[PDB]
A = this chain, B = another copy of it.
Amino acid sequence: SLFELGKMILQETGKNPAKSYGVYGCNCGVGGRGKPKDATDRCCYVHKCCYKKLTGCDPKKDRYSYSWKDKTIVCGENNSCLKELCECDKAVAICLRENLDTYNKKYRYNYLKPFCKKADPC
């Protein structure tokens, strides 16, 4: 759910997940996908494409188990879909951390998302 996703992003990046990524660029947070603004935005693009493959669980609402071991996200137990979901969320948390170097505040709070160029197919 939004909670596990946000907590993962926080644990990896050290940044409040909702503030930095809740409405970032053309792909992060609210909305669907769009032409990525930067590398951070591309993380979210990939993430949303990851969500499309899921069958049997709801990435927005369903809760799942993971833990923090040796400063690493470790997906737990779960079933087929929740495991895949957990790994989706882990991957975007890692990707966002990896691209902190080019994170740009000017892409925060983008309620102009409807002006984004249409995203390519996943």
Contacts and interface: CB of A to CB of B under 8 A. Distances in A.
A36 to B, nearest CB: 18
Interface in A1-47: 1-3, 5-7, 16-19, 22-23, 29-32
B2 A111 contact: yes
Majority DSSP secondary structure for residues of A touching B = loop
Interface of A: 1-3, 5-7, 16-19, 22-23, 29-32, 60-61, 63, 108-115
Contacts of A1: 114
B19 A2 contact: no
A1 B22 CA distance: 17
B2 A30 contact: yes
B114 A61 contact: yes
A29 B21 CA distance: 13
A109 B114 CA distance: 21
A111 B60 contact: no
Nearest to A62: B114
Contacts of A60: 31
A60 B29 CA distance: 13
Nearest to A3: B114
17 contacts: A2-B111, A2-B114, A3-B111, A3-B113, A3-B114, A7-B111, A16-B109, A18-B23, A18-B111, A19-B108, A22-B30, A23-B23, A29-B30, A30-B30, A31-B60, A61-B114, A63-B114
